[PDB]
Amino acid sequence: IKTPSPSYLKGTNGHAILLLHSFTGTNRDVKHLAAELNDQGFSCYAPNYPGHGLLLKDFMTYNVDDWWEEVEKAYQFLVNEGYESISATGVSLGGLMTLKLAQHYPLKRIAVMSAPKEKSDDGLIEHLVYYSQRMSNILNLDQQASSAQLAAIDDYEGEITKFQHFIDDIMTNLNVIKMPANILFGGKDAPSYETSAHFIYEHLGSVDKELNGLKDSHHLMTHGEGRDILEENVIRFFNALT
């Protein structure tokens, strides 16, 4: 049980793309999309947020400051490798990280999948419970081990509040994002993600921006139904760099 190492695909076209994963996910959320972009010539870097991949109690000793710091380090890695063209994409939390990156750095373009404009305490807790349940079954943890992981959720309340403020701060400042942008959501995701996507699209400062609601995509747009259409759309968007 460990947090995965980052995934760096070297390409040939001189353009680099950061790919950022979901809350409680890992970079396996973006593996296929990264590889497909690299097959088109891009360099791709998919970091893993600290804490992710660990059992729930350990996971909850990291927070949004740690996850953002890793994103900053990933961007700096690409700068230090010599890339002059750096772009970003991500799903859910990774979409939020992409927007925050765009507020900090001269990204060439961004593609944001399934970003929320707010999250409730109950919604975040439910995601932690699902993560803990899935981890325990994969690891075949016994009754007592699995039960203790869920016991620790109450002490994460302050970090949930921090996560909510992190979202709010990004959403308040979308007007500062001005590079070309592609905002995507899935028609088989909850309605709130369509509402969120419209809000994000409308508040971006970018002159060149598009909104794509893909009817057969689910929340994790990179996986499952609709994936070929999602990838075609995202790859076409980044191919405008070439």
Q: Would you name the residues annotated as active-site residues?
A: 92, 189, 219
**Per-position DSSP letters for 162-217, written without gaps between them:** HHHHHHHHHHHTGGG--S-EEEEEETTS-HHHHHHHHHHHHH---SSEEEEEETT-
Nearer to Cl ion, 103 or 239 (CB): 103
Q: Does 98 bind Cl ion (CB under 5 A)?
A: no
Least distance in angstroms from the C-beta of 175 to Cl ion: 22
- With both helix axes pointing from N to C terminus, report the angle between 143-151 and 121-139 in degrees, rounded to the nearest 10: 160
Strands 85-91 and 43-46: unpaired
Least distance in angstroms from the C-beta of 208 to Cl ion: 26
Nearer to Cl ion, 16 or 183 (CB): 183
Least distance in angstroms from the C-beta of 92 to Cl ion: 4
**Number of Cβ atoms within 10 Å of the Cβ of 190:** 15
Q: Distance from CA of residue 82 to its chain's centroid?
A: 24
Site for Cl ion, residues 10 to 29, rule: CB under 5 A:
23
State which residue has the least CB distance to Cl ion.
93
Q: Does 92 bind Cl ion (CB under 5 A)?
A: yes
Number of residues in contact with Cl ion under rule CB under 5 A: 3
- Return the amino acid letter for 91: V
Q: Does 93 bind Cl ion (CB under 5 A)?
A: yes
Nearer to Cl ion, 93 or 221 (CB): 93
Q: Read off the DSSP letter of residue 24.
A: T
Nearer to Cl ion, 23 or 156 (CB): 23
| Integer Cα distance of 16 and 242 in angstroms | 12
Closest CA to 116 of 172, 197, 49: 197
Least distance in angstroms from the C-beta of 112 to Cl ion: 12
Per-residue x/- track, 49-88, Cl ion (CB under 5 A): ----------------------------------------
Q: Which residues bind Cl ion (CB under 5 A)?
A: 23, 92-93
